[PDB]
Enzyme design. Structure first.
Site, PDB file in Angstrom:
ATOM      1  N   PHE A 108      42.168  53.883  38.789  1.00  0.00           N
ATOM      2  CA  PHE A 108      42.473  52.911  37.693  1.00  0.00           C
ATOM      3  C   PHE A 108      42.585  51.465  37.735  1.00  0.00           C
ATOM      4  O   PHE A 108      43.126  50.785  37.183  1.00  0.00           O
ATOM      5  CB  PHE A 108      43.933  53.210  37.413  1.00  0.00           C
ATOM      6  CG  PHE A 108      44.268  54.756  37.754  1.00  0.00           C
ATOM      7  CD1 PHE A 108      44.053  56.168  36.678  1.00  0.00           C
ATOM      8  CD2 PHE A 108      44.821  55.128  39.105  1.00  0.00           C
ATOM      9  CE1 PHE A 108      44.663  57.147  37.261  1.00  0.00           C
ATOM     10  CE2 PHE A 108      45.549  56.787  39.196  1.00  0.00           C
ATOM     11  CZ  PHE A 108      45.121  57.508  38.276  1.00  0.00           C
TER      12      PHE A 108
ATOM     13  N   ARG B 151      42.812  44.218  50.934  1.00  0.00           N
ATOM     14  CA  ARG B 151      42.674  43.443  49.946  1.00  0.00           C
ATOM     15  C   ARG B 151      42.678  41.650  50.199  1.00  0.00           C
ATOM     16  O   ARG B 151      41.353  41.011  50.122  1.00  0.00           O
ATOM     17  CB  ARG B 151      42.805  43.483  48.092  1.00  0.00           C
ATOM     18  CG  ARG B 151      42.059  44.466  47.546  1.00  0.00           C
ATOM     19  CD  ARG B 151      42.501  45.740  48.098  1.00  0.00           C
ATOM     20  NE  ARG B 151      41.222  46.375  46.951  1.00  0.00           N
ATOM     21  CZ  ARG B 151      42.147  47.401  46.065  1.00  0.00           C
ATOM     22  NH1 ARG B 151      43.181  46.388  45.844  1.00  0.00           N
ATOM     23  NH2 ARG B 151      41.171  48.096  45.140  1.00  0.00           N
TER      24      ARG B 151
ATOM     25  N   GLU C 158      48.181  52.280  42.257  1.00  0.00           N
ATOM     26  CA  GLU C 158      46.115  52.417  42.429  1.00  0.00           C
ATOM     27  C   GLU C 158      45.425  51.476  41.430  1.00  0.00           C
ATOM     28  O   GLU C 158      44.724  51.894  40.896  1.00  0.00           O
ATOM     29  CB  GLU C 158      45.728  53.933  41.814  1.00  0.00           C
ATOM     30  CG  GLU C 158      45.318  54.671  43.093  1.00  0.00           C
ATOM     31  CD  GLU C 158      43.949  54.502  44.072  1.00  0.00           C
ATOM     32  OE1 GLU C 158      43.767  53.774  44.096  1.00  0.00           O
ATOM     33  OE2 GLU C 158      43.990  55.619  44.854  1.00  0.00           O
ATOM     34  N   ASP C 159      45.926  50.326  41.492  1.00  0.00           N
ATOM     35  CA  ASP C 159      45.453  48.943  40.608  1.00  0.00           C
ATOM     36  C   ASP C 159      45.580  49.293  39.191  1.00  0.00           C
ATOM     37  O   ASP C 159      44.469  49.000  38.623  1.00  0.00           O
ATOM     38  CB  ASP C 159      43.966  48.703  41.147  1.00  0.00           C
ATOM     39  CG  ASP C 159      43.815  49.526  42.417  1.00  0.00           C
ATOM     40  OD1 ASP C 159      43.781  50.476  43.163  1.00  0.00           O
ATOM     41  OD2 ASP C 159      43.620  48.209  43.200  1.00  0.00           O
ATOM     42  N   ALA C 160      46.825  49.528  38.715  1.00  0.00           N
ATOM     43  CA  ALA C 160      46.895  49.951  37.570  1.00  0.00           C
ATOM     44  C   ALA C 160      47.925  48.164  37.166  1.00  0.00           C
ATOM     45  O   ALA C 160      48.821  48.586  38.165  1.00  0.00           O
ATOM     46  CB  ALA C 160      47.440  50.688  36.889  1.00  0.00           C
TER      47      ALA C 160
END
Ligand SMILES: [Mg+2]
Ligand SMILES: [Zn+2]
Ligand SMILES: [Zn+2]
Ligand SMILES: [Zn+2]
Lengths: 1098, 901
Positions: free
Chosen positions: B459, A898, A725-727
């Protein structure tokens, strides 16, 4: 034949010569040169009540930036001094006054009317024309562009407003009332006048005039302007048989008024109802003079031209009623004009000068009335000299520029200059905002119009409610400055057009408009426009004149006004571009400049109007016979921050917008003055690096001298689920070696205020006697003068400057300045200055080291954002078979949905560049193609796909699949967790509500809004709701009598509760409640509302 | 022994009540004196209270905080009209008579209105309708029935001005300006018997009281004064307005006593009325708002109550709270789904009061001994008497020894404590949940990744708030009602919400895909990592070369399932329906087919589980996904929340291990189509463009047939858009056909882990057609979007069709068209959020307080029965089987398999 490289060589000279903030500098220079004199001439002179005494204004000039010290001296001032001392960079305005006595003028006297702030690096500033070494000695960064004001030590920048074009007719549709309306915003001396002519369902034309309560019939107001004969209106409206028929119908429906006096009396009755006979006539004449088309002339002689313009507007309305012409869209940039710094400054100066002249006349009249004629007329020079207060003007200008509330209802005109880095500042200096309210949808306003091509950046725009209402200029933009209108009018008159009053616009003739007002007619419009184009290209007239013709309506438009947005284009003649190879060679050798190309007829600027007749060819090899212009460089249509993204055409538009917006938040060496500057906040990146894959534009605009990021080695795989999750996952050894390590500065400020009466503050070590004296450990590293030692360690709530205030609201209040409660760092520098008022001023900056940690936000130029999810030891990181250990790991799930293929192309290009030893061009549309990069990567011993074989860190055996790995440019954002964490256990409370305060600085509490209340109700937890709402905030106890319900008043003296209204003591009960409810009851009883409380027992 | 407010009866005040309530008459129009010392009789008189430190009031004394504040009063020289009751005053005046003050209604009409008004007086709307009817009937009359007097018409002006047309000579009816004195005389004569017919009670609302004679002064605490930088003591706008009233009415009294010409008296009366009007309501229509020195309107009583930041909402509805924290969130999959990682720094600050009992005396004593600087310590200690002490290193040992039964200790947070975790905005119920605390060193909240879908959090910089309940009942409610594992099933559609996301699904597919096999070390390591308490490995499935055992992924997955579970369905990966049909025939023939046959006819696309053994299938989003997690739903419905929690905590870790140690990546070559596909795509695009051009030419020649669409141009645009959409769909079909399932991006898209086929066909084939508001790009120059096209061109490319792909790069015109396309989506979200928010607020206020009673009915607060049985069925949607009242087929199959087995 030319190639895009030659056009790039030509284009870069434009920025090399003009710069990037010319729209401010040129406008301010024009203002200083002529606007002050124009306003002074507009006001004319002073007319006091003194008999046979008059004052005639002469000339006005501006001195040099100076400061009046508290001590008698007057000394030159430099921008750094103004920044440090909280002064205001300004220069005095000297105005000469000619006294007229008995109709006779005397020797003029020079007076000082006040000070005017100086835009930095303008033709009147001290930094103008200085070399780099001189600027460095003066303490300024040579790369600094200027174009901003300094007000009270803070940098204020004026954002350009986007207004409707003035003195132009726009026809719109009103289907609710079925009225066809045309509107004009007439401008004269800063006053606006919305004049509208409309046609309702009945087919009768009505005119709306300011200060006139209700619309008046068209021919009524037309007769009121003279021109009483019906044939005159018939001729003025036009010579189309249907138009004549409709005009005659209006005449028949309005045969009541046939004399100008009748119409004047009528408007007198409307505008001045129920008053004297003589008053209404004069009010009607005044409204006609200065409310109906003021720009055409306020003099009473100018009725005929105003009537002709009104007839033109009515003709447009009725033509659109028949469908001959369509509705005009307001977003077309031909109808929009930008309000530059100079125009707004002139408006503010006029507003302040009105107050100045009013005060001058008041003071002179009062002094003459108080004293005698001998005292005044004996020395008229001293009288005039001592009858002036400049502070009236100076304070108005200063406050208007500081707060940003322009006189006239405008707000947010000036904003604090951003200085996070190079891109943020330079982008803030090139912003355009719209005056529309943000709350409403404004679906049509927020969209991207087709005329924005080359004038407005299509990507750079805010995310929230400002989306589409805040925009930035494209790179190839050139705002214009006005030129003498009368000279252009004379030239056009000499060209061969017959004046308007001689003959009527026969549809066989062509109408000619100059800046939106009709001026005459001609027979061959095409010949006229060709003649003007030839004269413009030869160099006979200025290059700000733009001509466009409309074949359908047979109209010719000439524009020479202020604030048009234009772009340059190469002129194509007979299918051959006029820019040849030897011209490019001459430009490269320096023998030729951009201005020379402009004057040679090779390149001409086009506004939104002239571009209507153009047919532009995008590429040099696409030029054909019908093309009239050639695009210079298509990659320049993007704004300054949007050019940072390499390969921007391979990304989805929202991601490009996010990246452009985020390029203004990254840390880096923004300016070389960070050590000696005094800003509220500032960041510095320890080891900035030039991007490996970069567009060729940012080398020209100077970004590569102040980079704001680093080059990471990125691998794309999932690791322990800590990068989901976009970490992102970051190597620990790399961080410990100086990767993304930054520093944070914050400047605190204290002033030794000098209260009235002689009681002043002082800097000292506060003894334990004083009230408010905090712990002894807080003042532990202050020297005996009351100032902290540089390079000492502070940790929060520690006193930086010890200062005690007088007890006046035998004691001494403690008013020391301490570090913010949650912050920490080391003292960097301490500055001792003397402020403008003569008191002392101390500024202290505390620097803090910020190693990357969990929660710190990173972002790439392609819109990918994330926070650090886990820090991994080096030995646990995978390693490729060629010996590369990733610096940072991203999740493969973030690439699709994206749709940022540009990131993968940059990843390939970075490793190709690093292996090959040369940087890679990544320009918007002329950059190195992907296939070439893949082939080059194949030639260097790596797989063309960019994938590699790695071994797992823990197990030590190779992964089943080969992994993608490369070099990508990453930026550290300033949203860092050390500045966002906040906790509150008990804290202080407010006064009125006694609830916890708001804000991290004052130990505030978080907000538990209504939505959380509904959530807690939905869960069905009543007692939890009580605990979160009432128990821990505003607990109260109140006594109430059991028959009135009025709040019983306890008596501390008699130890007995009682009802004052009711006189009751037999039954009084004690009830728990909230403080807010008690205050609400008090507030209801403040009005006549009486709430009676009925009590019950549980 | 305390009482509670059972009911409130609103009423209008009276001058006698104002006089009795107040304790001082404010006559001096001064606020403060030198060095404080408020002027006696001033607007800051100490009689009304004390705000600053060091002084006492006189009515009740005590500190500034102790004084609750007391009311004052100002006796006005001449009556004025209240703004709020202006319209009511106008209606009363134009309805009642002037001489006798009685309503202009006949006796029998009064009787019938009396009969109907009492009948069903509960409802407000019908009451107002009856009031309006009575008002109209009274107004239409000319001569009063009781007395033969001509009731002249009365007119009203917005700024509370009444000037009726008094009879003039020759019946001119001159508009005599009514004064508040004569209006008061009019209202006082009105009797009380017919007051209910006027919508007024005879006890708490007297028409005479409706006109002001003496008004009260809010207490000093209600109008606080805040000291500025230079001790300006800038008071509330209410104080300034009060000073204005006092000065004005003082001068009015002076000129009244002097007997000056009555014109000046009337002018002062108007000024006083305007000032009172601004005081009551500064925004009242028809008057100029009274701005302050800097041109800002004063915030009087009316604006103080109303607004988002007003009193009623935003101040009692919501407020700042104690014991709360906020920080960014970072992922952590190693904790249970009902736990939150809390920074050690937050734990040291936030505290939970604990009462010292017999069974926790030792731990509390030790933690008090730890002090406030070591982690497992305390900050404050509360003795049984009530006084609160602070823990310091000087008194740690003494306080620890004095601790005994009945004391209270404000300890630090500990593992296992219950807290509230919230993310804003709070759209639905699950936005706030209760997690157990687990302390961590760094400075960010750690949240399990399966819990993201409820909070709708990512996040990428998001921040979340944490609340710590303080009372035992609050803690019990948080622990029992809002535990995370209790909210696995969503109450919106009856399906799971807390499920696997992204890597969980993808790793499940990788683990249970066909052909996946794992060695001994991998099996043992992943089983230990997941946390399964296995002790002996199962028998190896296949022996590879060199004699090493191998285990299939299905066995490892089946080790995580319950012993008695049987279910079969079709997941998203199905592409050959014939295999699923054959498998369904085998299963349906006899409900327990032999396992070997099922293994023979296995196929990824038909998940089949038999007594906890995964016999055929691949893990997909339909297994334990966010929306349709059949296995998770079945477990949580048939075994319990604890079993579902354990299952989730095991499968998440196992799938994470699989995806981490097997390798999973995407690259630039994930969209590398072969040459044949590119040629086919170019052919499709060229054919579509040719068809569009043919349509355009047919339209130009006028041969176009008008569709039922009204305008020929609209028909042309619709046909063009249909053609272009079909072209893009065909290109997507061929692009998807030419990419296999070995591609990682295709795996991620097909299983539902991330993205969809549209992203693949836009990154590989072409973007397609860009449009705004459902129409092709048309805004721009006259007849053309950009100056680079000829005017009047309607071709595909000239209006927005982008024939390039993200991989092949876009030409500048295509780039501009795509930007114009994306701006619409951005502004769409920006406006949609606000519209949805307003709608939700209206709905919540409409349906806030409905509940289910003990008999099953849903009743309104007053008692009206909304529903005789909730949901027409009586079944909670959260506990329903995906909206069904009960899943009969599943129950029948489960029971049949259980007993026959
Ligand atoms: Mg987010
Ligand atoms: Zn009472
Ligand atoms: Zn008191
Ligand atoms: Zn009567």
């Amino acid at each position: 034949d030319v190639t895009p490289d030659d056009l790039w060589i030509v284009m870069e000279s434009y920025w090399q010569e003009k710069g990037l903030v010319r729209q401010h500098l040129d406008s301010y220079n024009a203002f200083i040169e002529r606007g002050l004199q124009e306003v002074v001439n507009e006001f004319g002179g002073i007319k006091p009540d003194i008999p046979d005494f008059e004052v005639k204004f002469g000339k006005i000039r501006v001195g040099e930036p100076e400061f009046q010290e508290p001590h008698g001296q007057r000394k030159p001032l430099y921008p750094m001094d103004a920044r440090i001392r909280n002064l205001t960079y300004a220069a005095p305005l000297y105005l000469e006054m000619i006294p007229v006595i008995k109709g006779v003028e005397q020797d003029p006297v020079e007076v000082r009317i006040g000070e005017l702030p100086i835009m930095l690096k303008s033709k009147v500033c001290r930094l103008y024309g200085l070399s780099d070494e001189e600027l460095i000695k003066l303490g300024e960064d040579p790369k600094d562009p200027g174009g901003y004001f300094i007000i009270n030590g803070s940098e204020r920048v004026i954002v350009s407003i986007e207004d409707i074009a003035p003195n132009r007719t726009l026809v719109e549709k009103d289907e609710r009332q079925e009225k066809y309306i045309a509107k004009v915003f007439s401008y004269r001396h800063g006053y606006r006048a919305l004049v509208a002519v409309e046609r309702r369902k009945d087919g009768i034309l009505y005119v709306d005039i300011p200060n006139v309560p209700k619309p008046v019939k068209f021919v009524y107001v037309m007769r009121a302007l003279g021109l009483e004969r019906d044939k005159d209106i018939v001729e003025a409206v036009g010579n189309d048989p249907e138009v004549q028929q409709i005009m005659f119908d209006n005449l028949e429906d309005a045969s009541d008024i046939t004399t100008q006096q009748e119409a004047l009396e009528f408007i007198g009755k409307l505008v001045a109802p129920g008053q004297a006979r003589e008053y209404r006539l004069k009010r009607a004449e005044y409204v006609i003079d200065n409310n109906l088309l003021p720009h055409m002339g306020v003099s009473p002689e100018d009725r005929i031209k105003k009537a002709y313009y009104l007839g033109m507007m009515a003709l447009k309305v009725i033509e659109l009623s028949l469908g001959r012409r369509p509705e005009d869209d307001k977003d077309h940039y031909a109808n929009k004009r930008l309000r530059l710094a100079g125009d707004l400054l002139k408006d503010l100066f006029r507003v302040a000068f009105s107050q100045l002249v009013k005060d001058i006349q008041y003071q002179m009249t009062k002094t003459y009335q108080r004293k005698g004629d001998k005292y005044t007329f004996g020395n008229i020079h001293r009288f005039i000299r001592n009858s002036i207060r400049p502070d009236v003007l100076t304070e108005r200008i200063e406050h208007a520029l500081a707060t940003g509330a322009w006189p006239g209802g405008r707000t947010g005109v000036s904003q604090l200059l951003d200085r996070t880095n190079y891109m943020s500042t330079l982008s803030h200096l090139r912003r355009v905002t719209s005056p529309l309210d943000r709350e409403q949808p404004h679906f049509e306003a927020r969209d991207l119009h087709g005329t924005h091509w080359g004038r407005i950046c299509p990507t750079e725009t805010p995310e929230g409610p400002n989306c589409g209402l805040v925009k930035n200029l494209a790179l190839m933009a050139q705002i214009t400055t006005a030129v003498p209108e009368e000279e252009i009018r004379e030239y056009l008159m000499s060209l061969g057009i017959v004046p308007i009053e001689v003959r009527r616009p026969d549809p066989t003739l062509w109408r000619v408009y100059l800046n939106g007002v009709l001026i005459g007619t001609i027979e061959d419009g095409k010949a006229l426009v060709q003649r003007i184009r030839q004269d413009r290209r030869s160099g006979k007239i200025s290059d700000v004149i733009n001509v466009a013709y409309y074949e359908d309506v047979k109209e010719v438009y000439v524009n020479s006004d202020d604030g048009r947005v234009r772009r340059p284009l190469i002129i194509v003649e007979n299918g051959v571009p006029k820019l040849t190879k030897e011209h490019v060679q001459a430009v490269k050798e320096g023998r030729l400049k951009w201005s020379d190309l402009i004057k040679m007829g090779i390149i001409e600027y086009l506004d939104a109007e002239e571009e209507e007749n153009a047919y532009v060819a995008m590429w040099p090899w696409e030029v054909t016979e019908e093309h009239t212009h050639l695009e210079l460089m298509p990659a320049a249509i993007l704004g300054l921050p949007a050019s940072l993204v390499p390969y921007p055409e391979h990304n989805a538009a929202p991601r490009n917008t996010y990246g452009a917006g985020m390029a203004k938040q990254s840390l880096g060496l923004g300016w070389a003055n960070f050590r000696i500057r005094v800003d509220t906040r500032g960041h510095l990146l320890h080891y900035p690096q030039i991007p490996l894959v970069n567009s060729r534009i940012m080398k020209a605009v100077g970004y590569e001298d102040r980079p704001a990021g680093q080059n990471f080695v990125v691998a794309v795989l999932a690791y322990q689920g800590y990068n989901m999750e976009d970490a992102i996952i970051i190597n620990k050894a790399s961080i410990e070696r100086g990767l993304a390590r930054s520093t944070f500065f914050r400047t605190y400020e204290a002033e030794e205020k000098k209260y009235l009466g002689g009681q002043t503050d002082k800097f000292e070590i506060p003894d334990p006697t004083v009230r408010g004296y905090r712990g002894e450990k807080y003042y532990r590293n202050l020297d005996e003068d009351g100032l902290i030692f540089p390079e000492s360690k502070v940790e929060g709530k520690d006193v930086l400057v010890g200062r005690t205030s007088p007890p006046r609201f035998q004691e001494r209040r403690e008013t020391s300045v301490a570090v913010r409660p949650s912050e920490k760092g080391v003292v960097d520098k301490v500055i001792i200055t003397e402020t403008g008022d003569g008191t002392k001023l101390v500024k202290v900056t505390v620097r803090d080291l910020r190693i990357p940690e969990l929660g710190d936000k990173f972002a790439s130029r392609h819109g990918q954002k994330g926070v650090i999810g886990l820090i991994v030891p080096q030995e646990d990181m995978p390693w490729t078979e060629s010996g590369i250990v990733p610096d940072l790991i991203v999740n493969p799930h973030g690439i699709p949905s994206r749709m940022t293929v540009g990131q993968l192309i940059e990843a390939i290009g970075g490793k190709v560049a690093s292996l090959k030893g040369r940087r890679v061009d990544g320009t918007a549309f002329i950059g190195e193609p992907e296939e070439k990069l893949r082939k080059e990567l194949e030639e260097l011993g790596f797989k063309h796909t960019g994938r590699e074989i790695m071994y797992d860190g823990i197990t030590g055996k190779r992964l089943e699949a080969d992994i993608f790995i490369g070099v990508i440019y990453y930026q550290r954002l300033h949203h860092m967790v050390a500045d966002k964490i906040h906790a509150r256990s008990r804290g202080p409370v407010q006064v009125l509500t006694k609830q916890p305060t708001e804000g991290r600085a004052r130990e505030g509490g978080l907000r538990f809004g209504e939505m959380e209340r509904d959530v807690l109700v939905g869960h069905g937890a009543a007692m939890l709701l009580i605990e979160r709402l009432l128990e821990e905030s505003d607990k109260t106890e109140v006594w109430v009598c059991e028959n009135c319900g009025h709040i019983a008043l306890e008596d501390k003296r008699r130890r007995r509760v009682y009802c004052p209204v009711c006189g009751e003591e037999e039954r009084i009960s004690k009830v728990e409640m909230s403080y807010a409810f008690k205050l609400l009851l008090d507030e209801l009883k403040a009005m006549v509302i009486r709430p009676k409380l009925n009590l019950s027992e549980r | 022994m305390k009482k509670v407010i059972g009911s409130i009866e609103f009423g209008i005040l009276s001058p006698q009540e104002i006089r009795k309530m107040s304790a001082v008459e404010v006559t001096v129009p001064d606020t403060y004196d030198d060095d404080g010392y408020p002027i006696e009789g001033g607007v800051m008189d100490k009689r009304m209270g004390v705000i600053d430190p060091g002084l006492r009031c006189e009515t009740c004394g005590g500190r500034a905080g102790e004084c609750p504040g007391h009311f004052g009063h100002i006796e006005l020289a001449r009556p004025v009209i209240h703004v709020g009751f202006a319209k009511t005053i106008y209606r009363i005046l134009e309805s009642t008579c002037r001489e006798c003050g009685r309503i202009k209604l006949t006796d029998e009409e009064i009787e019938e209105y009396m009969k109907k008004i009492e009948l069903a007086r509960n409802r407000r709307s019908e009451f107002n309708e009856i009031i309006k009817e009575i008002h109209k009937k009274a107004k239409e009359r000319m001569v009063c029935p009781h007395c033969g007097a001509p009731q002249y018409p009365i007119k009203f002006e917005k700024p509370t001005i009444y000037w009726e047309i008094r009879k003039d000579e020759q019946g001119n009816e001159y508009r005599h300006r009514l004064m508040p004195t004569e209006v008061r005389d009019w209202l006082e004569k009105i009797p009380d018997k017919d007051l209910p017919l006027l919508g007024l009670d005879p006890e708490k609302s007297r028409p005479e009281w409706m006109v002001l004679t003496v008004l009260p002064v809010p207490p000093v605490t209600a109008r606080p004064s805040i000291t500025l930088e230079t001790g300006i003591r800038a008071e509330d706008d209410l104080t300034h307005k009060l000073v204005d009233i006092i000065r004005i009415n003082n001068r009015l009294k002076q000129n009244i006593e002097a007997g000056a010409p009555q014109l000046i008296i009337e002018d002062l009366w108007d000024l006083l009325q305007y000032h009172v009007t601004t005081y009551i309501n500064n925004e009242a229509p028809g008057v100029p708002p009274a701005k302050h020195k800097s041109g800002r309107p004063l915030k009087t009583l009316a604006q103080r109550l109303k607004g988002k930041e007003g009193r009623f909402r935003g101040n009692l509805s919501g407020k700042r709270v104690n014991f709360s924290a906020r920080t960014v969130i970072s992922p952590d999959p190693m904790i249970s789904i009902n736990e939150v990682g809390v920074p050690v720094e937050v734990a040291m600050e936030l505290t939970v009061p604990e009462k010292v009992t017999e069974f926790n005396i030792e731990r509390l004593r030790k933690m008090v001994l730890n002090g406030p600087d070591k982690y497992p310590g305390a900050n404050y200690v509360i003795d049984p008497e009530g006084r609160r002490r602070r823990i310091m290193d000087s008194n740690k040992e003494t306080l620890a020894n004095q601790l005994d039964i009945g004391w209270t200790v404000e300890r630090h947070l500990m593992d296992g404590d219950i807290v509230l975790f919230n993310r804003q905005p709070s759209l639905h119920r699950m936005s706030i949940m209760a997690h157990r605390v687990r302390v961590m060193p760094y400075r960010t909240f750690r949240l399990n990744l399966a819990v993201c879908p409820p909070y709708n959090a990512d996040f990428d910089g998001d921040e979340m708030n944490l609340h710590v309940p303080q009372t035992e009942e609050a803690q019990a409610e948080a622990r029992i009602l809002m535990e995370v594992q209790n909210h696995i099933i969503s109450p919106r559609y009856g399906g799971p919400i807390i499920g696997g996301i992204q890597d969980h699904i993808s790793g499940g597919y990788l683990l249970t895909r066909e052909g996946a096999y794992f060695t001994r070390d991998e099996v043992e390591q992943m089983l230990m990592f997941a946390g399964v308490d296995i002790t002996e490995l199962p028998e190896p499935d296949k022996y590879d070369e060199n004699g090493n055992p191998l285990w299939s992924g299905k066995t490892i997955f089946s080790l995580l399932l319950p012993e008695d579970l049987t279910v079969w369905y079709r997941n998203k990966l199905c592409d050959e329906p014939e295999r699923c049909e054959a498998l369904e025939k085998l299963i349906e023939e006899k409900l327990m087919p032999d396992p070997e046959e099922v293994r023979k006819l296995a196929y990824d696309g038909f998940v089949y589980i038999q007594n906890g053994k995964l016999l055929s299938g691949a893990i997909d989003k339909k297994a334990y996904g966010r929306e349709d997690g059949i296995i998770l739903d079945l477990i949580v419905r048939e075994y319990g929340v604890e079993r579902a929690r354990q299952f989730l905590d095991q499968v998440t870790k196992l799938t994470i291990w699989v995806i981490t140690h097997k390798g999973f990546t995407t690259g630039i070559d994930d969209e590398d189509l072969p040459e044949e596909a590119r040629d086919r795509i170019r052919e499709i695009i060229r054919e579509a463009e040719e068809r569009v051009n043919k349509l355009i030419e047919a339209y130009k020649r006028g041969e176009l047939e008008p569709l039922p669409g009204k305008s020929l141009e609209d028909t042309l645009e619709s046909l063009i858009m249909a053609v272009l959409a079909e072209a893009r769909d065909n290109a997507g079909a061929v692009a998807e056909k030419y990419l296999g399932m070995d591609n990682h991006t295709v795996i991620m898209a097909k299983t539902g882990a991330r993205g969809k086929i549209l992203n693949i066909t836009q990154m590989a084939a072409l973007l397609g057609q860009q449009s705004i508001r459902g129409k092709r790009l048309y805004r721009g120059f006259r007849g053309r979007v950009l100056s680079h096209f000829k005017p009047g061109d309607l071709g595909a490319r000239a209006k927005g069709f982008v024939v390039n792909s993200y991989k092949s790069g876009l030409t500048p015109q295509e780039y501009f068209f795509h930007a114009m396309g994306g701006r619409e989506g951005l502004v769409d979200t920006a406006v949609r959020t606000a519209q949805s928010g307003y709608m939700q607020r209206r709905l919540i206020n409409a349906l806030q307080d409905l509940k289910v009673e003990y008999d099953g009915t849903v009743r309104s607060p007053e008692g009206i029965i909304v529903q005789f049985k909730y949901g027409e069925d009586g079944v909670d949607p959260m506990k329903s089987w995906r909206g069904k009242t009960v899943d009969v087929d599943r129950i029948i199959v489960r029971t049949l398999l259980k007993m026959r087995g």
